Structure 1
Amino acid sequence: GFGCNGPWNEDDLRCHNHCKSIKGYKGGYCAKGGFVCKCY
């Protein structure tokens, strides 16, 4: 989710922005073929 909807729809920037918008995270990326929006 959050941009990462699979390799056919991978909005890594959208995941990144989401995660970065959350206090406690610097950013985020689409993992697992682009399915899982993982924050860091």
Structure 2
Amino acid sequence: GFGCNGPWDEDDMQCHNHCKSIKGYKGGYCAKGGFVCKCY
């Protein structure tokens, strides 16, 4: 979560680490044209 600005800038490990910090989750991915971040 909170790890993907968009085309100008973006990160995978940044948002991936956040989703991992939470228990029960697994991974993450940039949603909404890689502009938004979500965890699952």
Q: How many pairs are equivalent? A: 40
Cα distance, 1:33 vs structure 2 = 1.9
Larger Rg: 2
> TM-score of the superposition, structure 2-length normalised?
0.70
Contiguous gaps of at least 5 residues in structure 1: none
Contiguous gaps of at least 5 residues in structure 2: none
Cα distance, 1:2 vs structure 2 = 1.6
List 4+ stretches of structure 1 deviating above 3 A.
none
Whether the 8 Å CA contact 1:4–1:15 is kept in 2: the answer is yes
